[PDB]
C-alpha cells in the first residue's frame, strides 16, 4: 500500500543496557492515528508493549515494561520512538510499530491496528 511504517534502532545489547527504537511513518495522516509498539519472540504470540494516543496526551504500557520503557511521538516529523532501559533477556524479540486510525482512543488489541511495520530485532544477552 501507500502507507509505510519503518522501524529502526534495534541491535544487540547486554542486560542492563538501553536502546532507542524509532519508527518513520509515511503515506498517512499521522496525527490522526494512535501508534503502538508490539513485540514477538520466537515460538510466542505477538504481544502489546506500549501505545500513545494521536494527540500524544496519553500513554499506556504493558505491566512488564512500565517504568523502563517510554513511548513518544513527533507529529511534525511523523515518527514514533520507544526508549528502552534496563533491558533483560525477556525483552528479546522482534519489535513492531503499528498504527490505529482514530483520535482520543487507544487499545492493546492488535486486530484494531490498520498498518504494521516489518519489525526490528532487539537481542539482550545475559550479563
Amino acid at each position: 500500500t501507500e502507507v509505510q511504517l519503518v522501524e529502526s534502532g534495534g541491535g544487540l545489547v547486554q542486560a542492563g543496557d538501553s536502546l532507542r527504537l524509532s519508527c518513520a511513518a509515511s503515506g498517512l495522516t499521522f496525527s490522526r492515528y494512535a501508534m503502538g509498539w508490539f513485540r514477538q519472540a520466537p515460538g510466542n504470540e505477538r504481544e502489546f508493549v506500549a501505545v500513545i494516543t494521536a494527540s500524544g496526551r496519553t500513554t499506556l504500557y504493558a505491566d512488564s515494561v512500565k517504568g523502563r520503557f517510554t513511548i513518544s511521538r513527533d507529529n511534525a516529523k511523523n515518527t514514533v520512538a520507544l526508549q528502552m532501559q534496563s533491558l533483560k533477556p525477556e525483552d528479546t524479540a522482534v519489535y513492531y510499530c503499528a498504527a490505529d486510525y482514530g483520535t482520543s482512543r487507544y487499545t492493546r488489541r492488535q486486530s484494531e491496528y490498520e498498518y504494521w511495520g516489518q519489525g526490528t530485532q532487539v537481542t539482550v544477552s545475559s550479563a
Binding site: 494527540s55 496526551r57 496519553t58 499506556l60 482520543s104 482512543r105 487507544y106 487499545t107 492493546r108
Partner: peptide, 6 residues
C-alpha cells in the same frame, strides 16, 4: 473529552 482505552 479525555482519551479512553477501548
Amino acid at each position: 473529552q479525555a482519551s479512553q482505552e477501548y
